[PDB]
């Protein structure tokens, strides 16, 4: 899962493009892409960790320069095909049809109160990922730990720039859904979660800013005592 999307520390990506202002949605298709997230989540296409892994499998050149919500479209199609809920051939045919007939209607359908209720409940109640587990935390504030050098092909939250780096535990949060399992379709398998502080010199070398640090969240299997 060493994809280009894991961009922390990458050089040469260019200056920031930050217009003086911008709308929340730049086009109507973005509103659709956005609302497709609760729709496909409710329908069992994917959970959040799987959603991210779908984006991570994009063509990286397409990822780097496409509009953000296009990433979301790619992961819906990825999981629709994976689960057999989206027929690729039919999607291709419909894409050409709407290329040729852009003002053609959407299919007739019924509105559903339960989908509005779902949206309101997700937005204002949330989708909490905290879980209770039977083991106590292995680590505590002040522990000096080393981040794993493992390099799984599947989903994880192991940015290349922190792998094998030491760091100090700064806070235990409790246990949460574990991405390595959840994002690969292997269930929640929750693990204790920690914020770990890494100095800029540890991350970037002897010439690093002596007055800067990066805080990065580590599930328990990601860290071991670097032995203090």
């Amino acid at each position: 899962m060493n994809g280009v999307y894991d961009v922390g520390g990458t050089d040469g990506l260019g200056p920031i493009n930050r217009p003086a202002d911008e709308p929340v949605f730049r086009a109507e298709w973005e509103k659709v892409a956005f609302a497709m997230f609760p729709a496909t989540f409710r329908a069992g296409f994917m959970g959040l960790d799987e959603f991210r892994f779908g984006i991570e499998q994009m063509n990286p050149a397409e990822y780097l320069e496409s509009p953000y919500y296009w990433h979301w479209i790619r992961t819906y199609i990825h999981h629709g095909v994976r689960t057999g809920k989206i027929d690729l051939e039919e999607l291709e045919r419909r894409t050409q049809y709407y290329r040729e007939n852009p003002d053609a209607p959407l299919p007739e359908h019924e509105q559903k109160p339960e989908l509005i209720e779902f949206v309101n409940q997700a937005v204002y109640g949330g989708l909490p990922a905290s879980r209770e587990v039977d083991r106590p935390p292995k680590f505590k504030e002040g522990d000096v730990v080393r981040f794993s050098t493992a390099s799984p092909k599947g989903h994880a939250r192991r940015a290349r720039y922190v792998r094998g780096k030491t760091g100090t535990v700064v806070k235990h949060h409790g246990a949460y859904i574990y991405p390595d399992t959840a994002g690969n379709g292997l269930g929640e398998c929750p693990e204790h979660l920690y914020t770990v502080r890494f100095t800029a010199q540890e991350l970037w070398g002897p010439e690093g800013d002596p007055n800067s640090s990066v805080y990065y969240d580590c599930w328990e299997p990601y860290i071991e005592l670097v032995d203090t």
Partner: protein
């Protein structure tokens, strides 16, 4: 930047629009997406959820030391005291700017951002330019992109949101605001000041 391989923005939009209308039509036929569901999501994040909510939290912390203590202890629970919370802010941790420390937040792996207090992120936050550089050269980035000079002797802490913990910056209260009302104070609080890329507004 220039990529000689890249189609025009108009052509890219034309293609994406057809692809999305096709996928939309299929999810509509499956019964899992409807026009009212689409419109409701858009309405919430256009008009209901946005950085005015985080601003209310900041000004309460500025004017109420006990609330500020609760906010730094458990951001989710403090924010719920104000009726603020929900999707992509289920676990908030607020961090306090001081004369000794400056905080800035990023999601290097994607785009994670505390929706309940800031609304959806601006496009630059989600793009690779900011994400790649802010963990590596934050002082230089704040200076060059945001006109914000953090003196070298002052510590900068960059919070990378790799988990579902969502980090939010409590900016320092600008000087010259003693005894201002919460409403006046909120005019100084910006989404940028709660990401950490700018201070709260002066004067």
């Amino acid at each position: 930047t220039e990529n000689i391989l890249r189609k025009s923005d108009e052509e890219i939009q034309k293609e994406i629009t057809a692809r999305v209308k096709a996928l939309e039509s299929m999810l509509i036929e499956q019964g899992i997406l409807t026009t009212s569901m689409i419109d409701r999501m858009a309405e919430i994040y256009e008009n209901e959820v946005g950085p005015h909510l985080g601003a209310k939290v900041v000004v309460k912390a500025w004017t109420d030391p006990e609330f500020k203590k609760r906010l730094l202890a458990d951001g989710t629970e403090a924010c719920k005291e104000l009726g603020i919370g929900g999707l992509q802010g289920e676990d908030m941790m607020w961090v306090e700017n001081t004369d000794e420390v400056h905080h800035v937040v990023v999601c290097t792996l994607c785009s994670c951002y505390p929706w309940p207090v800031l609304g959806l992120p601006p496009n630059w936050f989600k793009e690779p330019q900011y994400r790649s550089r802010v963990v590596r050269e934050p002082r230089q980035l704040l200076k060059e992109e945001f006109g914000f000079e953090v003196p070298p002797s002052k510590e900068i802490k960059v919070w990378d949101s790799s988990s579902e913990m969502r980090f939010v910056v409590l900016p320092q209260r600008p000087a010259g605001t003693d005894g201002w009302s919460e409403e006046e104070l909120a005019t100084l609080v910006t989404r940028e000041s709660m990401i950490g890329v700018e201070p709260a507004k002066a004067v």
